[PDB]
């Protein structure tokens, strides 16, 4: 089970572990379009209205 060898190096040298806390946040960037909607889509009414 050599697959998890880097995971032990993910414990003390855990820069990678905190590095990918954004890619899953990037994975929900489509869900962040609603968060984008509350401000960006409010500029849609600037020219719409």
């Amino acid at each position: 089970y050599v697959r998890g060898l880097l995971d032990e190096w993910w414990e003390q040298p855990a820069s990678t572990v905190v590095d990918w806390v954004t890619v899953d946040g990037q994975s929900v960037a489509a869900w962040q379009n609603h968060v984008k909607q509350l401000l960006a889509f409010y500029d849609k009414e600037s020219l719409r209205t």
């Binding site: 414990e11 003390q12 040298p13 905190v18």
Partner: protein
Amino acid sequence: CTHIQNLQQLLFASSTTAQPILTPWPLMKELDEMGKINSKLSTAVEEVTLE
């Protein structure tokens, strides 16, 4: 007579390879690698908490 020759080569092996070997010959990896992660990477443990 016995010691002086013993003190130089055999009890030398029973001294130089006694306190870092006799108990710890398998604990050198528990001496140095222990200091590699929990003493050298010790400050690197805060890295996950800090970032």
